[PDB]
Design a protein around this motif. Structure first.
Motif, PDB file in Angstrom:
ATOM      1  N   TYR A 115       1.198  14.328   7.635  1.00 53.48           N
ATOM      2  CA  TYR A 115       2.017  14.517   6.433  1.00 53.48           C
ATOM      3  C   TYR A 115       1.248  15.349   5.457  1.00 53.48           C
ATOM      4  N   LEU A 116      -0.070  15.144   5.410  1.00 51.41           N
ATOM      5  CA  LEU A 116      -0.916  15.879   4.464  1.00 51.41           C
ATOM      6  C   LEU A 116      -1.143  17.311   4.892  1.00 51.41           C
ATOM      7  N   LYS A 117      -1.483  17.531   6.163  1.00 55.31           N
ATOM      8  CA  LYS A 117      -1.587  18.908   6.616  1.00 55.31           C
ATOM      9  C   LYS A 117      -0.272  19.644   6.324  1.00 55.31           C
TER      10      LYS A 117
ATOM     11  N   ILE B  26       0.818  -1.192   0.000  1.00 51.00           N
ATOM     12  CA  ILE B  26       0.000   0.000   0.000  1.00 51.00           C
ATOM     13  C   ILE B  26       0.867   1.263   0.000  1.00 51.00           C
ATOM     14  N   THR B  27       0.561   2.198  -0.900  1.00 48.54           N
ATOM     15  CA  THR B  27       1.330   3.444  -1.043  1.00 48.54           C
ATOM     16  C   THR B  27       0.431   4.584  -1.452  1.00 48.54           C
ATOM     17  N   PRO B  28       0.877   5.815  -1.204  1.00 44.90           N
ATOM     18  CA  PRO B  28      -0.053   6.862  -1.568  1.00 44.90           C
ATOM     19  C   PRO B  28      -0.088   7.153  -3.081  1.00 44.90           C
TER      20      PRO B  28
ATOM     21  N   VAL C 132     -11.214  20.228  -0.514  1.00 48.46           N
ATOM     22  CA  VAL C 132     -12.016  19.010  -0.284  1.00 48.46           C
ATOM     23  C   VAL C 132     -11.169  17.783  -0.505  1.00 48.46           C
ATOM     24  N   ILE C 133     -10.965  17.026   0.564  1.00 51.10           N
ATOM     25  CA  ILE C 133     -10.139  15.840   0.502  1.00 51.10           C
ATOM     26  C   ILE C 133     -10.955  14.624   0.054  1.00 51.10           C
ATOM     27  N   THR C 134     -10.437  13.884  -0.927  1.00 53.91           N
ATOM     28  CA  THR C 134     -11.126  12.712  -1.486  1.00 53.91           C
ATOM     29  C   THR C 134     -10.134  11.659  -1.910  1.00 53.91           C
TER      30      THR C 134
ATOM     31  N   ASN D 210     -14.346   8.751   8.729  1.00 56.19           N
ATOM     32  CA  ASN D 210     -13.525   8.592   9.903  1.00 56.19           C
ATOM     33  C   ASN D 210     -13.006   9.948  10.354  1.00 56.19           C
ATOM     34  N   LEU D 211     -12.839  10.862   9.402  1.00 56.36           N
ATOM     35  CA  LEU D 211     -12.323  12.190   9.690  1.00 56.36           C
ATOM     36  C   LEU D 211     -13.372  13.105  10.330  1.00 56.36           C
ATOM     37  N   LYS D 212     -13.218  13.360  11.626  1.00 56.41           N
ATOM     38  CA  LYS D 212     -14.205  14.139  12.378  1.00 56.41           C
ATOM     39  C   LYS D 212     -13.766  15.587  12.565  1.00 56.41           C
TER      40      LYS D 212
ATOM     41  N   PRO E 101       6.871   7.935   4.857  1.00 57.28           N
ATOM     42  CA  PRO E 101       6.315   8.463   6.109  1.00 57.28           C
ATOM     43  C   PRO E 101       4.785   8.435   6.135  1.00 57.28           C
ATOM     44  N   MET E 102       4.135   8.603   4.977  1.00 59.39           N
ATOM     45  CA  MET E 102       2.662   8.511   4.898  1.00 59.39           C
ATOM     46  C   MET E 102       2.057   7.228   5.519  1.00 59.39           C
ATOM     47  N   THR E 103       2.780   6.119   5.509  1.00 59.68           N
ATOM     48  CA  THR E 103       2.208   4.855   5.967  1.00 59.68           C
ATOM     49  C   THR E 103       2.733   4.408   7.359  1.00 59.68           C
TER      50      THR E 103
HETATM   51  N1  LIG Z   1      -0.758   4.903   1.135  1.00 60.02           N
HETATM   52  C1  LIG Z   1      -1.228   5.633   1.901  1.00 60.02           C
HETATM   53  C2  LIG Z   1      -1.771   6.475   2.784  1.00 60.02           C
HETATM   54  C3  LIG Z   1      -1.313   6.662   4.085  1.00 60.02           C
HETATM   55  N2  LIG Z   1      -2.143   7.602   4.643  1.00 60.02           N
HETATM   56  N3  LIG Z   1      -3.077   7.950   3.647  1.00 60.02           N
HETATM   57  C4  LIG Z   1      -4.057   8.844   3.808  1.00 60.02           C
HETATM   58  C5  LIG Z   1      -4.912   8.827   4.911  1.00 60.02           C
HETATM   59  C6  LIG Z   1      -5.935   9.749   5.092  1.00 60.02           C
HETATM   60  C7  LIG Z   1      -6.142  10.745   4.152  1.00 60.02           C
HETATM   61 CL1  LIG Z   1      -7.459  11.946   4.369  1.00 60.02          CL
HETATM   62  C8  LIG Z   1      -5.316  10.798   3.042  1.00 60.02           C
HETATM   63  C9  LIG Z   1      -4.301   9.862   2.887  1.00 60.02           C
HETATM   64  C10 LIG Z   1      -2.856   7.276   2.533  1.00 60.02           C
HETATM   65  N4  LIG Z   1      -3.558   7.360   1.378  1.00 60.02           N
END
Ligand SMILES: N#Cc1cnn(-c2ccc(Cl)cc2)c1N
Ligand SMILES: N#Cc1cnn(-c2ccc(Cl)cc2)c1N
Ligand SMILES: N#Cc1cnn(-c2ccc(Cl)cc2)c1N
Ligand SMILES: N#Cc1cnn(-c2ccc(Cl)cc2)c1N
Ligand SMILES: N#Cc1cnn(-c2ccc(Cl)cc2)c1N
Ligand SMILES: N#Cc1cnn(-c2ccc(Cl)cc2)c1N
Lengths: 182, 182, 182, 182, 182, 182
Positions: D137-139, C82-84, D81-83, D127-129, C123-125
């Motif tokens: 990492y995303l923020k 699994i990867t982003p 908007v996150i998707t 899940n995101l509340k 780092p994402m995972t």
């Molecule tokens: N691969 C992967 C991964 C790790 N975290 N996320 C992730 C989790 C939540 C959100 Cl909102 C976005 C990405 C992924 N897509």
């Protein structure tokens, strides 16, 4: 290659499991890929950037070669492989012949084999038994592509002579296989 | 690599047909590819997933290396190759130098060569004779990319010092080639 | 392979830097790629076009194998990574196990390991410590994918039995590594 | 618009079914799209090419606005908007707020709302509340993106102040809705 | 819509130039697009994000509707449009019927028309005269897709009953057209 | 349209903020898009699938029209818009003229304007002051594209006569604007 100077990944792939009818094709250019021509370097075992196509025209079907073949022009037998999704550059596919496209360029004859995957690999193409089963619109596109893609390569030209069938394809495979072993 | 432990596909590619001016680049990262950093493992002959780029920033030009070179930092000479369409990761291209981008990171100097394909390969870039012919907007993008892409790698930083020309590029090639053979 | 007939690029990749917990995965099928199944030919060192997937269903995560392992079914240990962003087919990634998906097909058991890159690589995972941290929607998708992708392969079927954890994953790695060296 | 001169598709979309908590977002820029900035022309009902982004940086999440809102800066409330897959430019999505990113540019304050689809639309994000459930990492990527994307727009700059929660998001929606009707 | 509350871009598109045989289809979901379901809001004249498909399965052909039709279920007549390249979401295409796929879900009957572009628009499909000319592998894929795509929508199910021909398609068009004008 | 029968989204877009030099272009076909020809229906305010291009050739630059213009052939003034990334179909862009391509087809003259975005929108193209600044390789590609793309449309042909400059472009805009208001 010159005497003075002359002093694996591709060439160790069998030409085919049951020649000439059952053969292998290493893919160099996927159908519909951006207009960059790759050519396998069989010494180095890597794809080489050959040309950015002047007309920017794209291959309408997958393009590759049969390893361990040597055609009259000094290169392996060339094959167009029709598939419902483009194939990965540098992958190998088990194929069967539908026929050939006969053409000549500024350098001499040039025939491209037309092929599809083995039936078990691609059930989508199993219906295609010979060149005449390939849709007219697609054969036309392929002929147009070969007539025009090199329109802006200085000193080059291509003339398409027409189609041929499976025996002609097989003879090409047969001879190419022979030539490669002297 | 440690004494105790120390007890092809890339390293057999010539550094160049006519060094330093005519050299080969193996592509690791295509321009505009998703923000994953690949690095060629020259022992294994495969691309390795190095890093998912923290900032998610993408290479604005193709990124690769010259085989059979060893730069002061212990890695091959790095090259940015500008093309009108991204190049295939793991392909090889015949290139010529336009100059370099001088920068330093937390580990020391780091220069990236800036290159384009050989004229016959890419007529689109034949107009580019030196670093100063590369559009301002693009040089700016590249400098910004190197300044920022590692912004979210903990402990890392990059500072761009400015540009240099073809002699400087050639010296880098010259020395890298030398170092690789001890 | 038959007695009579029996008379590098992949098999020289280490199974792992610190087995079973730290292992390498060569990617065969990127997440979300067009519905063509590739399988590494470990003799030839190339990806082979295995099947155009009848249902046209796509891998919801990256798919690959651990080199230098031999599982009970005669193939290397299989891994879902699994990867982003999808990984490049034919690349190698440093991975760690989250667990496994237990299933059986017409030919016997078939377990797929579930993995993510090493923390420094991705780092994402890093947040994912075990199979139960993987989102429910995704585990459901993966289970559905394995249940259905072969729905239109004549004579085939797949039944998913459920999940297992890291010890089970490690045992699979452990045994696969052993088997490969007789 | 000047007095002298002053002499549907977007503005007829409701701001929300149950404001401020349940609102609509028209998408202008998909996550990961090529680095071109579109802005909805609400008079014309079309997306306008606003800018080719100088840094070539891409939106790490989808970007849009809530119709029938007017924020202090004279534009509608902006939303990220996150998707799990990018959304179609010019589509509308039912959304819910997670919070906001507070920042200021050369022209004054600028807050971007952070949102996800309604749970029934996107179970992946249910899940995101709140803002703190969004991966670090995303923020970080989003903050970096806003800090740097305009680095090469002459005369511009952006400073990110930090995050805020759902009440703050709702107040923004509340006021924007009010302002739009005088 | 409730009494109390009840107190262009799509609905002004003609259902067809020569009904039922020559009709128009507005595209909502391109073949092979990422697994997000869009639905045209005919009041608003925009595509709405309906659902992120739980199974992540993709439409194997283009999906849309005939404007100014109202089917028994309260929605316009649905059409699958086969083309050699995916069509743009929100575009309109001149189409002709090949037949239908009969199915029922938890809510009642649900038939999807199967169509191709007008011959002058798409010469590639002119060969297809009826449902039985559509390749077996593709009809199978489509049936599988409808059977499985909603597998992970809680409370939903779909059962495919089989195929029907052009008269059946035309009756559907005929009645839908009638119903829309009361 | 016939007497008997004759008994917004596009036509309400201004032709330009400062005609003829500063004008607007609605994009119909993005550069490098799959070989499907869209044409804006200005009555309906939607893009219509016009033709699957027989040769499968793709537009080498973006293609669109100036709203509220009527050229001699009965259609709006056509424009090729060069950009560093393809533009979204159905978007609008502020443009400036570089010149024109003069050609004639089986139906009469046909000139396509050649344009780039306004400098503030696209700094990448600000360097281009006239048709002669456009790279030779690209002008050649465009001329080749127009000469060949319709090669397989029965009864059609196109002949390219050569280039013209900004005055010629402006006259075309000037007259088109006039004609549209009778
Ligand atoms: N691969 C992967 C991964 C790790 N975290 N996320 C992730 C989790 C939540 C959100 Cl909102 C976005 C990405 C992924 N897509
Ligand atoms: N490759 C391939 C292939 C084989 N059959 N088809 C096919 C034929 C008809 C239709 Cl309507 C769709 C696909 C292909 N594209
Ligand atoms: N690579 C490259 C390259 C070389 N010339 N161009 C170029 C220059 C101007 C314009 Cl308008 C388009 C392409 C490139 N993108
Ligand atoms: N958008 C979104 C979203 C929601 N959950 N995830 C997610 C989280 C973890 C992993 Cl391993 C994959 C996807 C997303 N990418
Ligand atoms: N759509 C479509 C269509 C029509 N004919 N084909 C087709 C049939 C056979 C082959 Cl070998 C390729 C394309 C399509 N894909
Ligand atoms: N569009 C465009 C455009 C403007 N300048 N360029 C450009 C020119 C030279 C190079 Cl090497 C790259 C891009 C374009 N592709």
């Amino acid at each position: 290659m010159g005497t003075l100077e002359a002093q694996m990944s591709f060439s160790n792939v069998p030409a085919g499991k049951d020649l000439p009818q059952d053969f292998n094709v290493i893919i160099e250019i996927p159908a519909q890929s951006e207009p960059v021509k790759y050519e396998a370097d069989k010494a180095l075992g890597l794809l080489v950037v050959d040309r950015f196509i002047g007309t920017g025209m794209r291959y309408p079907v997958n393009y590759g070669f049969i390893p361990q073949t040597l055609s009259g022009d000094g290169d392996p037998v060339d094959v167009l492989v029709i598939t419902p999704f483009p194939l990965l550059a540098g992958s190998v596919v088990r194929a069967r012949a539908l026929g050939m496209l006969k053409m000549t360029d500024e350098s001499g004859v040039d025939a491209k084999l037309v092929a599809v995957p083995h039936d078990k690999v691609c059930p989508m193409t199993a219906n295609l038994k010979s060149i005449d089963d390939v849709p007219a619109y697609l054969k036309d596109q392929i002929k147009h592509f070969f007539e025009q893609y090199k329109a802006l390569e200085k000193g080059k030209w291509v003339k398409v002579e027409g189609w041929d069938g499976i025996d002609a394809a097989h003879k090409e495979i047969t001879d190419g296989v022979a030539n490669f072993k002297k």
